[PDB]
Design a protein around this ligand. Structure first.
Ligand SMILES: CCCCCCCCCCCCCCCCCCCCCC[C@@H](C)CCCCCCCCCCCCCCCCCCC
Ligand SMILES: [Cl-]
Length: 119
């Protein structure tokens, strides 16, 4: 079945994934849950998401998204969708970096459930 995500990403993120899970107490079960579109404002999962974004320069130290870098990572068929979604979902806000990413995740997942994923 079609999947926009390219296979190369998985090995590329492996080291950071392991580190981020360890740092924040994230379980694979929590990742599975958010991947299926189920998310709650639990730091062990929200901080994991922040951690991974940060690792790949997709956010700054205050969880502001670098839209150009994000766009650069996405395939051509997703560009306009991403700009539309980002139009809606940015700027981020929340009580802290992890909560900012929670709010962002909620917005993005709701706006584009069919393309949503978390590694
Ligand atoms: C409409 C499109 C929506 C996108 C679906 C949600 C997935 C967003 C995760 C970001 C992944 C973007 C590219 C995926 C890999 C591209 C492969 C290219 C390899 C180049 C090096 C690989 C790394 C740069 C991979 C970085 C992985 C970051 C994982 C972050 C997971 C946490 C997501 C939580 C927040 C989501 C909002 C993030 C803000 C996104 C707004 C709009 C797109
Ligand atoms: Cl932002």
């Amino acid at each position: 079945a079609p999947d926009w995500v390219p296979p190369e990403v998985f090995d590329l993120v492996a080291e950071d994934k392991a580190r981020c899970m360890s740092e924040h107490g994230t379980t694979q079960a929590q990742i599975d849950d958010v991947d299926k579109g189920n998310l709650v404002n639990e730091p062990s999962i929200t901080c994991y998401m922040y951690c991974l974004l940060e690792a790949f320069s997709l956010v700054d130290d205050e969880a502001n998204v670098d839209e150009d870098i994000m766009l650069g990572l996405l395939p051509d068929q997703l560009q306009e969708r991403a700009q539309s979604v980002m139009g809606k979902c940015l700027p981020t806000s929340g009580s802290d970096n992890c909560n900012k990413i929670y709010n962002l995740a909620k917005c993005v997942q709701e706006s584009a459930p069919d393309v949503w994923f978390v590694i």
